[PDB]
Amino acid sequence: GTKASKSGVPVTQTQTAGADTTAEKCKGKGEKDCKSPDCKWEGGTCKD
């Protein structure tokens, strides 16, 4: 609770460290190329 109201350490929960930030290997792929487990196909566009 109330003790610092900011904390000395940031206490980062998660910031998609595993992902390559943006896997632009997906970007450019057609629907067939775009693997769903790999990349999210949305709006006729393959994107990580």
Side-chain angles (χ1 to χ4, degrees):
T2 311
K3 189 175 180 64
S5 305
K6 60 174 182 293
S7 305
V9 291
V11 192
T12 308
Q13 176 188 172
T14 176
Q15 292 182 301
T16 192
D20 283 59
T21 301
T22 311
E24 299 188 67
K25 296 297 177 63
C26 306
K27 196 57 152 295
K29 293 184 175 299
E31 173 184 294
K32 59 173 62 66
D33 305 303
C34 197
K35 302 182 183 181
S36 296
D38 275 55
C39 319
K40 195 65 162 56
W41 183 256
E42 306 185 311
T45 302
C46 191
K47 51 180 176 175
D48 172 59

Coordinates of all heavy atoms in Angstrom, one line a residue:
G1 N 0.8 -1.2 0.0 CA 0.0 0.0 0.0 C 0.9 1.3 0.0 O 1.9 1.3 -0.7
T2 N 0.4 2.3 0.8 CA 1.2 3.5 0.9 C 2.5 3.3 1.6 O 2.6 2.7 2.7 CB 0.4 4.6 1.6 OG1 -1.0 4.6 1.1 CG2 1.0 5.9 1.5
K3 N 3.6 3.6 0.9 CA 4.9 3.4 1.4 C 6.0 4.2 0.6 O 7.0 4.6 1.2 CB 5.3 1.9 1.4 CG 6.6 1.5 2.1 CD 6.7 0.0 2.1 CE 8.0 -0.4 2.8 NZ 8.0 0.0 4.3
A4 N 5.7 4.4 -0.6 CA 6.6 5.1 -1.5 C 5.8 5.8 -2.6 O 6.2 6.9 -3.1 CB 7.6 4.2 -2.1
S5 N 4.7 5.2 -3.1 CA 3.9 5.7 -4.2 C 4.7 5.9 -5.4 O 4.4 6.9 -6.2 CB 3.2 7.0 -3.7 OG 2.5 6.8 -2.5
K6 N 5.6 5.0 -5.7 CA 6.4 5.1 -6.9 C 7.4 3.9 -7.0 O 7.6 3.4 -8.1 CB 7.3 6.4 -7.0 CG 8.3 6.6 -5.9 CD 9.1 7.8 -6.2 CE 10.2 8.0 -5.1 NZ 9.5 8.4 -3.8
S7 N 7.9 3.4 -5.8 CA 8.8 2.3 -5.7 C 10.1 2.6 -6.3 O 10.2 3.2 -7.4 CB 8.2 1.0 -6.4 OG 6.9 0.7 -5.9
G8 N 11.2 2.2 -5.6 CA 12.5 2.4 -6.1 C 12.8 1.7 -7.4 O 13.2 2.3 -8.4
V9 N 12.4 0.4 -7.5 CA 12.5 -0.3 -8.7 C 11.3 -0.2 -9.5 O 10.2 0.0 -9.0 CB 12.8 -1.8 -8.4 CG1 14.3 -2.0 -7.9 CG2 11.8 -2.4 -7.5
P10 N 11.4 -0.2 -10.9 CA 10.2 -0.1 -11.8 C 9.2 -1.2 -11.6 O 8.0 -1.0 -11.8 CB 10.9 -0.1 -13.2 CG 12.3 0.2 -13.0 CD 12.6 -0.4 -11.6
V11 N 9.7 -2.4 -11.2 CA 8.9 -3.6 -11.1 C 8.1 -3.9 -12.4 O 6.9 -4.0 -12.4 CB 7.8 -3.4 -9.9 CG1 7.2 -4.7 -9.6 CG2 8.5 -2.8 -8.7
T12 N 8.9 -4.0 -13.4 CA 8.3 -4.3 -14.8 C 7.7 -5.7 -14.8 O 8.3 -6.7 -14.4 CB 9.4 -4.2 -15.8 OG1 10.1 -3.0 -15.8 CG2 8.8 -4.4 -17.2
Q13 N 6.4 -5.8 -15.2 CA 5.7 -7.0 -15.2 C 6.1 -7.8 -16.5 O 6.5 -9.0 -16.4 CB 4.2 -6.8 -15.2 CG 3.3 -8.0 -15.4 CD 1.9 -7.7 -15.6 OE1 1.1 -8.6 -15.8 NE2 1.5 -6.5 -15.4
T14 N 6.0 -7.2 -17.6 CA 6.3 -7.8 -18.9 C 6.2 -6.8 -20.1 O 5.4 -5.8 -20.0 CB 5.2 -8.9 -19.3 OG1 5.5 -9.4 -20.6 CG2 3.8 -8.4 -19.2
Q15 N 7.2 -6.9 -21.0 CA 7.3 -6.0 -22.1 C 7.6 -6.7 -23.4 O 8.5 -6.3 -24.1 CB 8.3 -4.9 -21.8 CG 7.9 -3.9 -20.8 CD 8.9 -2.8 -20.5 OE1 10.0 -3.1 -20.2 NE2 8.5 -1.6 -20.7
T16 N 6.9 -7.8 -23.6 CA 7.1 -8.7 -24.9 C 8.6 -8.9 -25.2 O 9.0 -8.7 -26.3 CB 6.3 -8.1 -26.1 OG1 6.3 -9.0 -27.1 CG2 6.9 -6.8 -26.6
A17 N 9.4 -9.2 -24.2 CA 10.8 -9.4 -24.3 C 11.1 -10.6 -25.2 O 12.2 -10.7 -25.8 CB 11.5 -9.6 -23.0
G18 N 10.2 -11.6 -25.2 CA 10.4 -12.8 -26.0 C 10.3 -12.6 -27.5 O 11.2 -13.0 -28.3
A19 N 9.4 -11.8 -27.9 CA 9.2 -11.4 -29.3 C 10.3 -10.5 -29.8 O 10.9 -9.8 -29.0 CB 7.8 -10.7 -29.5
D20 N 10.6 -10.6 -31.1 CA 11.6 -9.7 -31.7 C 11.1 -8.3 -31.8 O 11.4 -7.6 -32.9 CB 12.0 -10.3 -33.0 CG 12.9 -11.5 -32.9 OD1 12.5 -12.5 -32.3 OD2 14.1 -11.4 -33.5
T21 N 10.3 -7.8 -30.9 CA 9.7 -6.5 -30.9 C 8.7 -6.4 -32.0 O 7.5 -6.2 -31.7 CB 10.8 -5.4 -31.1 OG1 11.8 -5.4 -30.0 CG2 10.2 -4.0 -31.2
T22 N 9.0 -6.6 -33.2 CA 8.1 -6.7 -34.3 C 8.7 -7.6 -35.4 O 9.6 -7.2 -36.1 CB 7.8 -5.3 -34.9 OG1 7.5 -4.3 -33.9 CG2 6.7 -5.3 -35.9
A23 N 8.2 -8.8 -35.5 CA 8.6 -9.8 -36.5 C 8.1 -9.4 -37.9 O 7.1 -9.9 -38.3 CB 8.2 -11.2 -36.1
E24 N 8.8 -8.5 -38.6 CA 8.4 -8.1 -39.9 C 8.7 -9.1 -41.0 O 8.7 -8.8 -42.2 CB 9.1 -6.8 -40.3 CG 8.8 -5.6 -39.3 CD 9.3 -4.3 -39.8 OE1 8.8 -3.8 -40.8 OE2 10.2 -3.7 -39.1
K25 N 8.7 -10.4 -40.5 CA 8.7 -11.5 -41.4 C 7.3 -11.9 -41.8 O 7.0 -12.4 -42.9 CB 9.5 -12.7 -40.8 CG 10.9 -12.4 -40.5 CD 11.7 -12.2 -41.8 CE 13.2 -11.8 -41.5 NZ 13.9 -13.0 -40.8
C26 N 6.4 -11.5 -40.9 CA 5.0 -11.7 -41.1 C 4.5 -10.7 -42.1 O 3.7 -11.1 -43.0 CB 4.2 -11.6 -39.8 SG 4.8 -12.6 -38.4
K27 N 4.9 -9.5 -41.9 CA 4.5 -8.4 -42.8 C 4.9 -8.6 -44.2 O 6.1 -8.8 -44.5 CB 5.1 -7.1 -42.3 CG 4.4 -5.8 -42.8 CD 2.9 -5.8 -42.5 CE 2.4 -4.4 -42.4 NZ 3.0 -3.7 -41.3
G28 N 3.9 -8.7 -45.1 CA 4.3 -9.0 -46.5 C 3.7 -10.3 -46.9 O 3.5 -10.6 -48.1
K29 N 3.5 -11.3 -46.0 CA 2.9 -12.6 -46.3 C 1.5 -12.5 -46.7 O 0.7 -11.8 -46.1 CB 3.1 -13.5 -45.1 CG 4.5 -13.8 -44.7 CD 4.5 -14.8 -43.6 CE 5.9 -15.3 -43.2 NZ 6.5 -16.0 -44.4
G30 N 1.1 -13.4 -47.7 CA -0.3 -13.5 -48.0 C -1.0 -14.4 -47.0 O -0.4 -14.9 -46.0
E31 N -2.3 -14.5 -47.2 CA -3.1 -15.3 -46.2 C -2.6 -16.7 -46.0 O -2.5 -17.2 -44.9 CB -4.6 -15.3 -46.7 CG -5.5 -16.2 -45.8 CD -6.9 -16.3 -46.4 OE1 -7.6 -15.3 -46.3 OE2 -7.3 -17.4 -46.9
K32 N -2.2 -17.3 -47.2 CA -1.7 -18.7 -47.1 C -0.4 -18.8 -46.4 O -0.1 -19.7 -45.7 CB -1.6 -19.3 -48.6 CG -0.7 -18.5 -49.5 CD -0.5 -19.1 -50.8 CE -1.8 -19.3 -51.6 NZ -2.3 -18.0 -52.0
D33 N 0.5 -17.8 -46.7 CA 1.8 -17.7 -46.1 C 1.7 -17.5 -44.6 O 2.5 -18.1 -43.8 CB 2.7 -16.6 -46.7 CG 2.7 -16.8 -48.2 OD1 3.2 -17.8 -48.7 OD2 2.3 -15.8 -48.9
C34 N 0.9 -16.5 -44.2 CA 0.7 -16.1 -42.8 C 0.3 -17.3 -42.0 O -0.9 -17.7 -42.0 CB -0.3 -15.0 -42.7 SG -0.2 -14.1 -41.2
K35 N 1.2 -17.8 -41.1 CA 0.8 -18.8 -40.1 C 0.1 -18.1 -38.9 O 0.7 -17.2 -38.4 CB 2.1 -19.6 -39.7 CG 2.8 -20.2 -40.8 CD 4.0 -21.0 -40.3 CE 4.9 -21.6 -41.4 NZ 6.0 -22.4 -40.8
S36 N -1.0 -18.6 -38.6 CA -1.8 -18.0 -37.5 C -1.0 -18.1 -36.1 O -0.9 -17.1 -35.5 CB -3.2 -18.7 -37.4 OG -3.9 -18.4 -38.5
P37 N -0.5 -19.3 -35.7 CA 0.3 -19.4 -34.5 C 1.5 -18.5 -34.5 O 1.9 -18.1 -33.4 CB 0.7 -20.9 -34.5 CG 0.6 -21.3 -35.9 CD -0.5 -20.6 -36.5
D38 N 2.0 -18.2 -35.7 CA 3.2 -17.3 -35.8 C 2.8 -15.8 -35.8 O 3.5 -15.0 -35.3 CB 3.9 -17.7 -37.1 CG 4.9 -18.8 -36.9 OD1 4.5 -19.9 -36.4 OD2 6.1 -18.6 -37.2
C39 N 1.8 -15.5 -36.6 CA 1.4 -14.1 -36.9 C -0.1 -14.0 -36.9 O -0.9 -14.9 -37.4 CB 2.0 -13.7 -38.2 SG 3.7 -14.3 -38.6
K40 N -0.6 -12.8 -36.5 CA -2.0 -12.5 -36.5 C -2.5 -11.9 -37.8 O -2.1 -10.8 -38.1 CB -2.3 -11.6 -35.3 CG -3.8 -11.5 -34.9 CD -4.3 -12.8 -34.4 CE -5.6 -12.6 -33.6 NZ -6.7 -11.9 -34.4
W41 N -3.3 -12.7 -38.5 CA -3.8 -12.2 -39.8 C -5.1 -11.3 -39.6 O -6.1 -11.8 -39.2 CB -4.2 -13.4 -40.7 CG -4.7 -13.0 -42.1 CD1 -6.0 -13.0 -42.5 CD2 -3.9 -12.6 -43.2 NE1 -6.0 -12.6 -43.8 CE2 -4.7 -12.3 -44.2 CE3 -2.5 -12.4 -43.4 CZ2 -4.3 -11.9 -45.5 CZ3 -2.0 -11.9 -44.6 CH2 -2.9 -11.7 -45.6
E42 N -4.9 -10.0 -39.7 CA -6.0 -9.1 -39.5 C -6.1 -8.0 -40.6 O -5.1 -7.4 -40.9 CB -5.9 -8.5 -38.1 CG -5.7 -9.4 -37.0 CD -5.7 -8.7 -35.6 OE1 -5.0 -7.7 -35.4 OE2 -6.4 -9.2 -34.7
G43 N -7.3 -7.8 -41.1 CA -7.6 -6.8 -42.1 C -6.8 -7.0 -43.3 O -6.2 -6.1 -43.9
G44 N -6.7 -8.3 -43.8 CA -5.9 -8.6 -45.0 C -4.5 -8.2 -44.9 O -3.9 -7.8 -45.8
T45 N -3.9 -8.4 -43.7 CA -2.5 -8.1 -43.4 C -1.9 -9.0 -42.4 O -2.5 -9.2 -41.3 CB -2.4 -6.6 -43.0 OG1 -2.9 -5.7 -44.0 CG2 -0.9 -6.3 -42.7
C46 N -0.8 -9.6 -42.7 CA -0.1 -10.4 -41.7 C 0.8 -9.6 -40.9 O 1.5 -8.8 -41.4 CB 0.7 -11.5 -42.5 SG 1.4 -12.8 -41.4
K47 N 0.7 -9.7 -39.5 CA 1.4 -8.9 -38.6 C 1.7 -9.5 -37.3 O 0.8 -10.2 -36.7 CB 0.7 -7.6 -38.4 CG -0.8 -7.7 -38.0 CD -1.5 -6.4 -37.8 CE -3.0 -6.5 -37.5 NZ -3.6 -5.2 -37.2
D48 N 2.9 -9.3 -36.8 CA 3.3 -9.8 -35.5 C 2.9 -8.7 -34.4 O 2.2 -9.1 -33.4 CB 4.8 -10.0 -35.4 CG 5.3 -10.3 -34.1 OD1 4.9 -11.3 -33.5 OD2 6.2 -9.6 -33.6

